[PDB]
From Swiss-Prot, chain A:
The chain holds residues 133 to 495 of 496 of the full protein. Binds 1 Mn(2+) ion per subunit. Mn(2+) binds at residue 449. It catalyses: beta-L-arabinopyranose = L-ribulose. This is L-arabinose isomerase. Its cofactor is Mn(2+). GO terms for molecular function: L-arabinose isomerase activity; manganese ion binding. The gene is araA.
Length: 497, 498, 498
């Protein structure tokens, strides 16, 4: 997936009171910082220099054009000198893209010997940013605040992380989701108000019949299915039974047909996420398995059993984790392992696990019996899950508002092999332990379908929740369950209304 | 300036159930305690013995008289034996002065040999104060609670500090502020709802024209300024350029004239705080600088750019220290020092920093170029800031309610001197560090004008906020940024319409 | 007075299901309606016909441009056929302009002979707008809803009123107010949160010193002052004492200087409303009187004693009263007349009554001793107020939110003359009576300064409050006071927190 290049407008605030001379000093400092801060991180995204802003009307024009530009994904604001905040009121009302408030100073030390009134009037960010911060508090605007020196490497790393989530938010705003079928019957976590989700996040989620998708698979070029079968054999290890032209190899060709038809449909409608349900497979030979795994590799959002929210959420987590070495997948929490030394959980799905979370071992393509769905034996990629720290998140619908639950876990490498299990799986230790992660997750109402990621941080998800105006609950190393209960109660009283 | 000398009514509660004989022992215990707490680092600070209260009408008469007496600055109540709390209901409704609930005991140990029913009927505060406590919670009255023995130095230290806070609150109740000019143009944090401020704290904030001040400076005694120059030369070190008669010497006498005229005007209207703006000086020669520093040392609250909130807060924070050393000043956060190891902050203003916060060096009188204001080069005191634990306070207006933000800092001594810097300055390390103190302060909506003090504690500011019915957020050594965000949200849910 | 010409984007909605052919009839009907809808009360403002919107991206781009174009002052939307409302969500999210929802039908009768499936697929507005209506309720966006046929005269007349108030709303967002001095001291209703007012309506209210204005009166060319004095003799009826060359004629020249300086400064800062206070007049010869009333006729908003809220309201009511009778003025309720048959009120100010509300008798230029202000005797216009139905409105600050109180009155012609009264005055009968309107007004917290106007209706003010998101209470003929109390109570619980 490629996305429209996004920009970030770097804006400095100032006054006319300190003279026409100081304005040149500010402009010079900013023209010095923006390209050097664009070196940093850097090349992935674009920092554009949008001038010094001194009057209310000038800044109002800026944030109105920012709200009109689809390429602008956020404004970074910094008060170099003292800018009076009432000028920013009329402006902040119109600006809708996310605001980063960069509280920095140009110089790093105070020149104790040669500091005069002119310097004290030029590099006074310490209270100008305080003024701006107050206006941001009194208007109640969603804002990230990053404090430090702009040459300090942690501030640069934080800027990169924020820009990543901001472009993910921009894609979320125009997000299209396609559902083939309906929900698994009587399932509650999968249900939500689509209209409320579009007013909150902007997701347009629409339901198509499965027949339209079968119709799209009818018009796929078979030359392409054989050429794609060649790429499968080059990338994955086909079972010897399926390396020759038997019945098991036609199931792989059938899954290639399904993938190409899904590609055609998703590309025609500008969809970035889709969902399928096993309860509605009238016209397909087999339940889509390998196809959805490859589409997840391509960058598409997916979730099973008709879960449009979790699919959308993984699409957003896919986009906010372009620190190339990602690792992101649809997940379900299947079973526990209660051994006192290493309490761990085995997670997977019926078929649809993305290979982004795999191990250096090349995944193996296999066909095996799947009785859930009542269809033909499906083809799937099988692999063990990698090892490292990760986060698994789920978005749920409380009825009047959304909740984002994120649990930091550590994925561990499997000690033993699992020979009779014919689906890809991953093993992890949740934090702060098994009993406390599970208890806290149940208390928060967490879903069973989860979005697992190696490259999304807790900061990124908290920042997305802040841009979207939704509660974010975090279960990590410091989470006590007794206090987590009261945290939930107080959050519910805050977010009501 | 000085204050109308406030007293504190000490009241002990009991009932008629245990007999008239026990009542005499209770009154005796209280008559023993009151003078001991009236020496005990008390005085100057007068504790009056307001009798034992046993009847509902007796109690309500007391708190009705207390709310009508302007000299009473607070009631301290202690339940010696079990006094039923419904008698206090009608009372607590009428009392409008700060309440300290002293949960104490007369004796220190249990006399294991001679304890009987008669002893258990005298010193049952352990549950009597619980009874009273419930009525304080169920009626929702603002009360401070101090637990311990009345000879414990911790209880005495907290009583003294609380009496300071209560007298500061009493001064806040009748606080008058005079504004010379308007707000600095499009500045938002300096602006606020005056009427909402009178209903919350009682501050009478009124704006006078700047010409009304010039009218007062014409009527100053011309040799009163010469008399003030002698005090200047005795206390401060004038630059040699100003020790004889030249252009530098006229600038010092003009600031002395400004000081004398301001004194006359502020005392004429019983004002205790005032504000000036550099945008409105259409009759003065120079922006008031030396004069403002002298008046802040005299005990007046001041803030620049029309900041009546910061000025009022400075006057009350000056008063809650009354007998300490003691520095307190109006301040603005001017520059950072990002030396990896030395998170440091340089704070000052254009001119108006109080010498109460200075070091031991006697301040220097100077004249230098001030480009903001367009007036004459003004004379001011310059000095380096002292070192010690300190507080940064700011009162802000969220629109429907006020917020008091308090940051604990440690002021450090300047290692190098700043020769070309023509303003007095102070250096501090904020807690828990600079980076996340700034982060949390921006998140909390803190103003740029801050009230700096060496002698005011966080306890005092929390207690003032408790008496005033306003949210108080404290950012100190234990303050984390992640939890600070959600704690702010929960505070907003509690204080929204309270 | 300038006022940038504003346009209104007219948008029709439908879908792609009914074909490229049905879309053509939709577009054809719309280009027939829009120019025909610009005939009717459409000469001040321009109705622009924007594309038919059928997909979410067209709607989003349209509503993004509408909120980005400064010339667009509002969108008029009509669902010709069934447009699914989810496509409209993101657009309504981005739209920051007033929305009028016109629920109409192209044809007026249904052709019983030729009605088939195609007719039911083309003119299904009756349910197409209902879908849209739900989203307007579900997102909680401010909406006017007008139902009827697009050739019906009442819908067109209501469209005119809404377009006037929408242009006034566009002017409110760019409203600048300049204050010469502060509020009248210790006056509470005139005080408010300026920052909250910029967040609610967009008013930028800033205070300049009166010396800044005196400087502008010093730099006015007196040649122009004499040229304006020449206009005075042609328009107004000067007192015999002042038609010759003496001291009484110099007061008119001084007010001409005041007018020229006020104009110069007000246009120098692009201000549209201003306030002056008599408690701060250091540097002016006389309290501004004639000048302020002439500038109020020019289209400026004014209020005395520093009343920026009433000043802004006067400008907004002046702008929505561009059709056209159309008197509008600053007001104060000075005295009652308790004659049990014609209970009426006499209203005016110290000097500052705008001649827009005058009668046809030519106003008289007069000078008399004015002790309020303590300055020289000022020149002023004197006249009696006209007659007709009118509204006097007041905007007040509840601390956490604003309230717009509107009382409909009937202005009466004076029966007796007022020879010794040296101020312009107006007499009116409030509804439903004097003693009942006064009770309702006191309960609603109405100010003493009121904005009185003959040409702005109650609907326009109700709709302005709806566009601004503020409570509007109306006191008219049907107002019972018993139920008026409860309306206030229920409104207070609804309006806390938005
Ligand atoms: Mn399942
Ligand atoms: Mn300042
Ligand atoms: Mn008045
Ligand atoms: Na499609
Ligand atoms: Na006075
Ligand atoms: Na100007």
């Amino acid at each position: 997936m490629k996305m429209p290049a996004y920009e970030f407008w770097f804006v400095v605030g100032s006054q006319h009171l300190y003279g026409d001379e100081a304005l040149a000093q500010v402009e010079a400092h900013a023209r010095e910082m923006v390209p050097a801060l664009q070196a940093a991180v850097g090349n992935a995204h674009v920092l554009r220099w949008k001038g010094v802003l001194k009057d209310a009307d000038e800044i109002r024009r800026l944030c109105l054009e920012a709200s009109a530009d689809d390429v602008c994904a956020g404004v970074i604001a910094w008060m170099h000198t003292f800018s009076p905040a009432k000028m920013w009121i009329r402006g902040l009302l119109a600006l809708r893209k996310p605001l980063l408030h960069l509280h920095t100073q140009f110089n790093r030390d105070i020149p104790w010997d040669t500091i005069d009134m002119d310097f004290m009037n030029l590099n006074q960010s310490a209270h100008g940013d305080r003024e701006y911060g107050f206006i941001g508090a009194r208007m109640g605007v969603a804002r990230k605040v990053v404090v430090g020196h702009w040459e300090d490497p942690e501030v640069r790393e934080r800027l990169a992380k924020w820009m990543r989530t901001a472009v993910a938010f921009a894609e979320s705003r125009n997000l299209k989701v396609a559902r083939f079928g309906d929900n698994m019957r009587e399932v509650a976590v999968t249900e939500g108000d689509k209209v409320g989700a579009q007013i909150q996040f902007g997701w347009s989620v629409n339901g198509y019949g499965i027949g339209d998708l079968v119709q799209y698979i009818r018009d796929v070029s078979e030359q392409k299915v054989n050429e794609l079968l060649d790429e499968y054999e080059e990338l994955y290890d086909i079972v010897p039974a399926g390396r020759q032209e038997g019945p098991v190899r036609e199931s792989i060709r059938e899954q290639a047909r399904i993938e190409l038809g899904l590609k055609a449909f998703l590309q025609d409608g500008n969809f970035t996420a889709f969902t399928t349900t096993f309860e509605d497979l009238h016209g397909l030979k087999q339940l889509p398995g390998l196809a959805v795994q490859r589409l997840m590799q391509q960058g598409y959002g997916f979730a099973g059993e008709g879960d449009w929210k979790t699919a959308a959420l993984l699409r957003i987590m896919k986009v906010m984790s372009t620190g190339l070495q990602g690792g992101t997948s649809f997940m379900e929490d299947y079973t526990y392992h209660f051994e006192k030394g290493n309490d761990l959980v085995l997670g997977s799905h019926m078929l649809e696990v993305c290979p982004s979370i795999a191990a250096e071992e090349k995944p193996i393509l296999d066909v095996q019996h799947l009785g859930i769905g009542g269809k033909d034996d499906p083809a799937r990629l099988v692999f063990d899950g990698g090892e490292g720290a990760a986060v698994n998140a789920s978005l749920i619908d409380l009825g009047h508002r959304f909740r984002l639950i994120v649990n930091e876990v550590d994925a561990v490498k499997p000690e033993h092999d699992m020979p009779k299990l014919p689906v890809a799986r991953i093993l992890w230790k949740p934090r702060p332990s098994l009993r406390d992660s599970a208890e806290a997750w149940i208390l928060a109402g967490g879903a069973h379908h989860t979005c697992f990621s190696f490259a999304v941080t807790t900061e990124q998800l908290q920042d997305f929740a802040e841009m979207a105006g939704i509660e974010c609950v975090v279960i990590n190393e410091h989470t006590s369950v007794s206090s987590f209960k009261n945290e939930l109660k107080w959050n519910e009283v805050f977010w009501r209304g």
